[PDB]
Amino acid sequence: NLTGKTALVTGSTSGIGLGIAQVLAQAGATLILNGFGDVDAAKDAVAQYGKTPGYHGADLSDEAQIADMMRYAESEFGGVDILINNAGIQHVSPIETFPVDKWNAIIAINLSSVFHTTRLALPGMRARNWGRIINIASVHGLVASKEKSAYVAAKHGVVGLTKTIALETAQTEITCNALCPGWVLTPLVQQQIDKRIAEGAEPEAARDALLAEKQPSREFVTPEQLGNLALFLCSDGAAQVRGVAWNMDGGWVAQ
Amino acid sequence: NLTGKTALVTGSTSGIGLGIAQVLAQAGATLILNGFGDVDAAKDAVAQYGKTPGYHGADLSDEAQIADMMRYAESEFGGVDILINNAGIQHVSPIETFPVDKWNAIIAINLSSVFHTTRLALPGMRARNWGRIINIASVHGLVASKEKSAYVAAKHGVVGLTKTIALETAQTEITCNALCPGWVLTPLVQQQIDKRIAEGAEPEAARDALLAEKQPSREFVTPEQLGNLALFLCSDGAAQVRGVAWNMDGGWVAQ
Amino acid sequence: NLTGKTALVTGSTSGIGLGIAQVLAQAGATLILNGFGDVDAAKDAVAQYGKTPGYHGADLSDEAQIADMMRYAESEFGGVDILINNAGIQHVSPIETFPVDKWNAIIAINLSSVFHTTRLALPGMRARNWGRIINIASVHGLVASKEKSAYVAAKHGVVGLTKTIALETAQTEITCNALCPGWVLTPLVQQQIDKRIAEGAEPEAARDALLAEKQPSREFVTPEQLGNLALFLCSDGAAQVRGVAWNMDGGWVAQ
Amino acid sequence: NLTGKTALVTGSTSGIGLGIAQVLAQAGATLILNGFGDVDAAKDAVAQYGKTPGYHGADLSDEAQIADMMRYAESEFGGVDILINNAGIQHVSPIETFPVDKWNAIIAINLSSVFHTTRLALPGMRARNWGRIINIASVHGLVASKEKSAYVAAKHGVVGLTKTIALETAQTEITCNALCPGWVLTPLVQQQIDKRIAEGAEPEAARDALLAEKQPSREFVTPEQLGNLALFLCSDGAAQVRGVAWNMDGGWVAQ
Ligand SMILES: NC(=O)c1ccc[n+]([C@@H]2O[C@H](COP(=O)([O-])OP(=O)(O)OC[C@H]3O[C@@H](n4cnc5c(N)ncnc54)[C@H](O)[C@@H]3O)[C@@H](O)[C@H]2O)c1
Ligand SMILES: NC(=O)c1ccc[n+]([C@@H]2O[C@H](COP(=O)([O-])OP(=O)(O)OC[C@H]3O[C@@H](n4cnc5c(N)ncnc54)[C@H](O)[C@@H]3O)[C@@H](O)[C@H]2O)c1
What we know:
The first copy, chain A, has 255 residues and is an alpha/beta fold. The first copy, chain A, is built from eight helices and seven strands.
């Protein structure tokens, strides 16, 4: 189904990216993992679904390490066919006391890394005339929240970047699209929940408290749901899906 | 997959609607077709892939006929689990010389029919706590083209309507979403192309004729691709996709 | 400034329409008022700012009365130069128990009247090659709220209708735009404010009780603020403002 | 009107920024210009309408220079009341061969400079509980065009950033909004028009040529028209306009 396709999922040693990675693995694709933390756990969790994945530990905030990483992809796997730009970081702060370092890193990782990977994978994709570039944005690429200025900017930046590359590839068999999830039950978010429960909150009170304001369904998006959406974007049934910001968000943007 | 679930697709005797019906049918779904023309050919086109579909010939511009269709879906098939609002007529004209009956018929069929089917299907869906409401809007639900004032107003309307319904059902296992296609290769459009080709035009040349202005990829969207996106919305993968307006449009809205 | 221009504002006997009228009259415009209730109070509240206004009691839910009103505008003032479609009505209800009557009325008044007025004033505007069509929609022409299906549909529809008419007049000195306010302090909203104060709530506690969820500024838009925006749209600095849905909403849609 | 208020306009030694500076000056504002080129001409061009403006030559891609500009504003004029982020640069290129240094420059100037200038002005504004922040994005903050990946990403970014700042200030008398113009008749545009006219093109034909694809009115936006929209945003009539992205574009985004 995706057999003979190489998928690069950026920041896939945890959360959403690992979810998406496992799903593509299940579908038959060769995966290259990226990101820090528990790395052989990440490799193995994907390995259980087919081919053992490759790995490059590029720090995405560094243009040099990305170039290195892409050559590795090309030298060892013959070039990326499916590029999932997923990695990203957060910093919540009022703007007047938002750290400049944090601004530069959030831009570098959440916006500029998508430019750099897409830059380096596209030539190979054009030669083979086939490709999938999927950028994991956020609801915050479509709307904003207070105290997330660098993140909302970068993610908005991602959405615009995506429509551009889509138009640049419009007349080829290469598509470029963005997913915009709302709250996803990742390691980070389950932490916030379990330690509301620890305060005395009932589970389905800890959850919807954290989700009431922004997400009408009062339910989380799962990494698996996103992985299934990315897989549909990789399918032939998505041949004319181009330049889109598809939200999976329990009703967030509809509101 | 969709075995034991009843899907009603309005305007499914031809084109986009018929394509979506076949795709749900092969996925196990029990269908009810709607529309005019060669019904037995529409029936046979579906029964080829799955169960012999039901049929009801309601004029969608008549509120009472729609109610009979829902009374039919309830009696004979146990109610609607998957409601696909699809049918949608057209009249190109400057607003100044735009016939009032034409405005009224377009609003009634392309907008008011969506209100009627969804309000009569939703109680059954709520009792079972499961349902999918999928409205086929268009790119013209998100942007405008000149001389399509009634059509754009209706489709915009359908998008708004979809968002509202999703919010009223956010905390259930019932979702409401809109799909917004660009140019779709219907038989209606194959005939535009053939007639051009019959006058000396190269095939690709006739294709670029129709698509160069509004659709960057210059490739049509197919009913099948739309069926596959509709089927994904029906999956468990789409539990938290709510009140969206997803463009499948060769890059149309991206400009 | 606007002296020598005729402005027709629908539903201008109360609230938002009356405010816009008073501002336009102040700017020199001849006004034609429309709407029900305390008519003389409205006529005089306008005439205090200069020229004493005209009036027509067309029920905008009926197509033929709008034809009467418009032909009265032409046969008594020599046409409309500035058409403010403001009239609107509301019904809050879950969809499955939404009255069909209210649905039809809300569509007729909030959406279809804009079609009927615009199609009748436009020929005259085209002859004089100058015109302002300004449609008061809502934030609900852009996002949705539960239990307001007919209203959100109509207003979304209005936004789409505006975009098309703007494209149709693109190359003339006629512009067509929409305004999308959030909560505005009109007599119905103030009556809800006093409702809570009498309940025991302190004033600035009753307002944000009404505005917290949807309007981040926790401050009302005023009919005067809207009238000043509409006036700017009538100016020549707004020559190239076309197809627009400008929100004035205290941060509603940014969220 | 604006008497007593200090306005800083980045990139105001020419074009859009100079047009906006002139409109604010004649409204009574004290201006601080910024940018390169013929500075004394720019000062003179503003002083003819109102007070002799200040100037600061900060490189907007350099964060420390920006902070010196703001320290200059605090020391010489008492702080910024009206901050207008206007300065923006362009590089047209397919992403594959898009120079890195150009990507970094465009992001820094068109996006990060908005963050730095706004984070430094906001304390002053908050203390006085009054302020306007107006960011000149472009239609490319809302849609994409081919081969402007850095510019579209940056401008989209500005739009997101604008929304989130609006929200951090929603309950103050400080507003933050984005203006998104289409093609503006700047000197560069007028001089590429003269180029075509010098080669035999009729005037309208040359303008038609430049505007045909993307701007339906086929008429340019002017710096003065933009200045007057900015000035309206600075009025009390705009108190509840927050985190908007208002297009003034001859119908570009309406398509
Ligand atoms: N968690 C949510 O609710 C949510 C919602 C919407 C969008 N998103 C987006 O999905 C993406 C993944 O977020 P997540 O929730 O799965 O978090 P996560 O921490 O679980 O995983 C993020 C990945 O990014 C990696 N990473 C961080 N910095 C890196 C760097 N400099 N170089 C290389 N890798 C780096 C991490 O190693 C990790 O593998 C993000 O872009 C996020 O904005 C998340
Ligand atoms: N009040 C708000 O907070 C708010 C917010 C956003 C948008 N709007 C919209 O502004 C417009 C007016 O709102 P409002 O608050 O001033 O209401 P309002 O009740 O104070 O008065 C509006 C006008 O509508 C007239 N009207 C109603 N039905 C009519 C009919 N069949 N024929 C002729 N006139 C009719 C009324 O006579 C009145 O003059 C509407 O379109 C509304 O949706 C209001």
